[PDB]
Amino acid sequence: MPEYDYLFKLLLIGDSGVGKSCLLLRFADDTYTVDFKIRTIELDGKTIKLQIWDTAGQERFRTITSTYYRGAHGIIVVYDVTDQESYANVKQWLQEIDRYAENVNKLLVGNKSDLTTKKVVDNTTAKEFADSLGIPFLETSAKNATNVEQAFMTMAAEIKKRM
Amino acid sequence: MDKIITGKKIIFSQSVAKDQTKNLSSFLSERFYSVNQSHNHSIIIGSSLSHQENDIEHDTILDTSGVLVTTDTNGIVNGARVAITDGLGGGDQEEDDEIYRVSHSSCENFLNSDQNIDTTLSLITQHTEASMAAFIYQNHPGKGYIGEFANIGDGLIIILDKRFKIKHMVSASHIYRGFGTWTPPSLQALATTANKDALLVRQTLKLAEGDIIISMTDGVWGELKTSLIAQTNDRRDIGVDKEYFKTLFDELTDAPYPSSFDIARIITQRAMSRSLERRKTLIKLINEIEQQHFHEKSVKTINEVLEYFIKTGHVETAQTLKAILFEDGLSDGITYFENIEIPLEMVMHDLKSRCVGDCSTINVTRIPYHLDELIRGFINYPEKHQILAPLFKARVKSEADLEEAFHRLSLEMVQPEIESPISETHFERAFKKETLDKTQAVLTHYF
Ligand SMILES: Nc1nc2c(ncn2[C@@H]2O[C@H](COP(=O)(O)OP(=O)(O)O)[C@@H](O)[C@H]2O)c(=O)[nH]1
Ligand SMILES: *CC(=O)NCCC[N+](C)(C)CCOP(*)(=O)O
Ligand SMILES: [Ca+2]
Ligand SMILES: [Ca+2]
Ligand SMILES: [Ca+2]
Ligand SMILES: [Ca+2]
């Protein structure tokens, strides 16, 4: 007797402080004020279990050897719309995916969209950059819960479409 | 000829808390099996896996090993196909069953092909995964034995001569996948990857009579002393420390003709002895750390932990922790960096979560002697004596070479049950002495 139809492993990557844990906490526990959470969703009749990891820069502390050669099904690259430096590093985060990781699904998220008086990363430029790479783009707010659900749901749908 | 593939083994794996008062003989008997095709090919398969505090009711061994012995048109043994697989993941019986299915089927498809190793790999590859170390060897007229070797993942193949001097090593590989993560290549990844030669290690070697070929999954060789061979930006090549590996065979130097089982047993004993010491050290270190109540002493980093132990005279405990964290003392593939500040809670969450051990498998193969195998066929197929007897005029250099061949045959041992728990392996002579003596008198007369 199965408890789910699909198990998808999602990875959150990006500079420290952009809100990756808060996006995780908002999507799984609907809380806001912690680098792994689980949530099962339904999508086209299928029940999809999501295991979501915030890498949390643990690469800076240790190197590990996993038993699987397979990686995550999808990677969400997060930046902070109030921090141009966090956006500038996105190209480096994406190169670490392309250089090493088998046609993984990607999504680009600009978090903290509620801080509209501090928003300095132009979403038009971020959208066009993501479109040039075939990567969907969303602006989110973990604080306001805006587009948080839609981001993880859209990633899950894109993975289901490529299977 | 004979085709043997190990079966799925399921054992009750006691926790480290209950194995802590266990000697090595008891540990081996509870966890290991032997499969013996003949004097010259043997498999030891088992599990050293264990949780620190909980018993594993159904611990499925996710490795597989197999062999197909090939012959020439006269039925004389002249080669073999050997494969060992390591199912990735697991350790849920439903999930374990699916991983074992791919591990077992990958081994059997390699054995069942009648192709060279490159064509065979193309046929058996074209979302569960298994790594594989495998080889094929065959006698070629005018050329002798040639062996084709392939390794995909972190299994290991070592080739030795009849005096146990190392000749070659087919090293284990890890591929860097970014974010501080290394992964062993899998056979199924070899089918869904753009770059093939990065995941596959290939070697072709001349082999001599009496050479010893040892294949191991990481559950065995990873417990021995290991050595980093090379590390590029994308690739890590690993093997056993060759100076340490030779000291294992010091136990066999006076044996005229040790069975493959004897060779495999010596290596398994040493690997599991070290594994048993490691798991006892680990749970001892965790208890000594928790006894200090560092949370109530404002000790929040590993460096503060090490300094606390050095200042209180328990420098040995400090050095043990450093070895585990910074030198990967447990052979888990986890290495912390030395020039950073590491939170204690991150390490404690790591240490208390770690299992110890793994599925552990080794196969040992001896490259047969040409004359011995001609005699074996002459004894086993008396109906073909008219075809086989003329071949002795080209395989016998002297009556002394004949005598040496009959001496090796008299030492051969077989396990009629083929498979058994390791503490229940029963061996008997492959041949009766009256059979060999009658055969040797006939050939000496015909000479
Ligand atoms: N205004 C606002 N602040 C946020 C949002 N998401 C995260 N933060 C802030 O970011 C800090 C924590 O970010 P965190 O989730 O730990 O980032 P991480 O290091 O990438 O995991 C908190 O102090 C929050 O106030 C958001 O959507 N809106
Ligand atoms: C405690 C635990 O189960 N950790 C997961 C590691 C998986 N083990 C149990 C080590 C089996 C191996 O994975 P791969 O190296 O074949
Ligand atoms: Ca975080
Ligand atoms: Ca491994
Ligand atoms: Ca395995
Ligand atoms: Ca293994």
Numbering used by the authors:
A (entry chain B): 2 to 34, 43 to 110, 112 to 173
B (entry chain A): 20 to 110, 113 to 147, 163 to 483
Question: What's in the article?
Answer:
Legionella pneumophila, the causative agent of Legionnaires disease, secretes the enzyme AnkX that uses cytidine diphosphate-choline to post-translationally modify the human small G-Protein Rab1 with a phosphocholine moiety at Ser76. Through crystal structures of Lem3 in the apo form and in complex with Rab1b, we reveal Lem3’s catalytic mechanism, showing that it acts on Rab1 by locally unfolding it. Since Lem3 shares high structural similarity with metal-dependent protein phosphatases, our Lem3:Rab1b complex structure also sheds light on how these phosphatases recognise protein substrates.
Furthermore, as demonstrated for Lem3 wildtype, the mutants cannot demodify Rab1bS76T(PC), permitting us to obtain a stable complex. No specific interactions are visible for the C3 linker region while L68Lem3 shows hydrophobic interaction with the choline group. The phosphate moiety of the linker in complexT391C does not participate in direct interactions with amino acids, but is involved in the coordination of three metal ions located in the active centre of Lem3 at the same site as observed in the Lem321-486 structure and coordinated by the same residues (D105Lem3, D254Lem3, and D394Lem3, D105Lem3 and G106Lem3). In addition, a third metal ion (M3) can be placed in the electron density, which is coordinated by D254Lem3 and D190Lem3. Rab1b:GDP binds to the hollow region of Lem321-486. As a consequence, the sequence R71-T74Rab1b of switch II is reorganized into a β-strand (β’β3-4,Rab1b) and placed between the β-hairpin (located on top of the fist) and the thumb. As a consequence, Y78Rab1b is displaced by 9.9 Å (distance between Cα-atoms), likely contributing to the movement of switch II towards Lem3’s active centre.
